[PDB]
From a paper:
Amyloid fibrils are fibrillar polypeptide aggregates which occur in a range of diseases that includes several neurodegenerative diseases and different forms of systemic amyloidosis. The fibrils can have a length of serval micrometers and consist of cross-β structure and of β-strands that run roughly perpendicular to the fibril main axis.
To clarify its molecular assembly, we obtained the cryo-EM structure of the major seeded in vitro fibril morphology at a resolution of 2.69 Å, based on 0.143 Fourier shell correlation (FSC) criterion. The fibril contains two protofilaments that are arranged with a pseudo 21 screw symmetry. These properties resemble the previously described ex vivo fibril morphology I. The helical parameters (rise 2.4 Å, twist 179.425°) of the seeded fibril are also very similar to the ex vivo fibril morphology (rise 2.41 Å, twist 179.44°). The all atom root mean square deviation (RMSD) is 0.81 Å for the two fibril structures. The greatest similarity occurs at residues 51–64 (RMSD 0.46 Å), while the remaining part of the structures possesses an RMSD of 1.17 Å. Therefore, the greatest correspondence occurs at an inner radial position, where the two protofilaments are held together by reciprocal salt bridges between residues D59 and R61. Seeded in vitro fibrils were also stable to proteolytic digestion and persisted for more than 2 h under the conditions of our experiment, similar to the ex vivo fibrils.
Residue numbers in the entry:
A (entry chain H), B (entry chain J), C (entry chain L), D (entry chain F), E (entry chain D), F (entry chain B), ...: 1 to 69
Write the structure that this text describes.
């Protein structure tokens, strides 16, 4: 299939964005995650804009444009 | 299939955005997650805009535009 | 199928946005999640705009536009 | 399949962006992750713009443009 | 398949961006990761722009352009 | 398959960007990673621009251009 | 402009289907035409079907079809 | 401009299908035409079908088909 | 400009299909044409089919097909 | 410009298919044409099919096909 | 310019398919043409098929095919 | 310019397929042409197929094919 992972402007302990496929007779274990933040300024911020998730985009003409200032 | 994960401007302990597919005779275990925040300013913020989730977008013309100022 | 996950401006302990598909003879366990916040300012905020969830968008013309100021 | 991982502007303990495929008779274990931040300024920030996730983009003409200022 | 990993502007303890494929009778173990930051300024920042994830882009004409200022 | 790893502007303890393929009867172990930063200025920063991840790009004409200032 | 002349199954003396355009300070003369027919069988016949005269035909789909027997 | 002349299955004395364009200070003369037919069988006949005259045909899909028997 | 002349299955005395363009200070004369036919069988006949006159045909897909029997 | 002359299956006395272009201070004269036919069988016949006159045909895919039997 | 003359299956007295271009201070004269046919069988016949007159054909794919039987 | 003359399967008295270009202070005269045919069988015949007249054909792929039987 199509697997896509996009992530921007973020903070995490871990175990993120994974894609396990077609496994047979498997087994695993994952730990505990801790996230501690104290007294931080301006964290995990993203600017203006749009998100588009599309399986098929066909015959677009003069489309999907963005004009910032 | 089509799997898409998009995430911006966020903070988490963990175990996020995953896609397990086509598994047979499998087994797993995941931990406990802790998220602690104290006295932070301006966290996890996202700017203006739109979100579009589409399986098929066909023949768009002069569409999906954004004009910021 | 089509699986799409979009998330912005948020804070969580964990175990979010997942998509398990086509599994046979499987078993798993997930932990306990704790979220503690004390004295934070301006958290998890998102700016202006719209959300569109569509399976099929066909023949749009001069549509889906956004004008900020 | 198609696996794509894109990540920008972020801070994490670990175990991120992975893609396990076609495994048989396997087993593994992953640790615990800790993320500690105290008194940081301007962290994990991303600028303006858009995200597009597409399986197929066909016959685009004068599309997908961005104009910053 | 196609595996692509792109990452810019980030700080992590480790165990990131990996792609395990076609394994039989294997086993492994991974450690614990710690991320500690205190009193840093301007970390993990990315500038303006867009992200495009596409399996197939066909017959684009005068498309995918970016104009900064 | 096609494996591509691109990474710019970042700091990590280790164990990153790897691609294990076609292994049979193998086993390994990986350590613990520590990342400590205190009082640094301007770290892990990337400039303006776009990211494109594509399996096939066919017949592009006057496309994929970037104009900085 | 667009000038199109289509003629099928016909008999004439002459001076037909002409298109004079953009003339300045011109002059001409044309003769007399005689058409004489006596005792002919099966002349100037056209079979089944349709005529379409269009300046612009846009986005036709599964249209303009003809099924004879 | 676009000048197109199509003629099939016909009999004429002459002076047909002409296109005079952009003439200045010109002059001409044309004769007399005679058409005489006596006792002919099966003349100037055209088979089944359609005629389409179009300045622009855009984005036709599974259109303009003909099925004879 | 575009001048196209197509003619099939026909009989004429003469002076047909001509295209005079961009003439200055010119002059000419043309004769008389005679067409005489007596006792002919099966003359000037064309088979089944269609005629299309188009200035621009753009992006046709599975169109303009003909199936005879 | 583009001048194209296509003619098949026909009988004529003469002075046909000509294209005079860009003439200055010229002059000419043309004769009389005679066409006489008596007792001929099966003359000037064309088989099945289509005619297409186009200035521009762009991006046709699985189009303009003909299937005879 | 582009001048193309294609003619098949035909009988004529003369003065056909000519292209006079860029002439200055010229003059000429042409004769009379006679065409006489008596008692001929099967003359000037063309088989099945299509005619395409195009100034530009761009990016055709699996198009312009003919299948006879 | 481009001058092309193609002629097959035909019978004529003369003065055909000529291309006079770039002449200054010239003059000429041409005779009378006679075409006489009596009692001929199977003359001027052409087999199945297509005609294509194109100024530019760009990027054709698996196109312009003919399959006879």
């Amino acid at each position: 299939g199509f697997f896509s992972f996009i992530g921007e402007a973020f903070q995490g302990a871990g175990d993120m964005w994974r894609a396990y496929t077609d496994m047979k007779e498997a087994g695993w274990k994952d730990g505990d995650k801790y996230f501690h933040a104290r007294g931080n300024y301006d964290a995990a911020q993203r600017g203006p804009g749009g998100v588009w998730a599309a399986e098929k985009i066909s015959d677009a003409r003069e489309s999907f444009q963005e004009f910032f200032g």
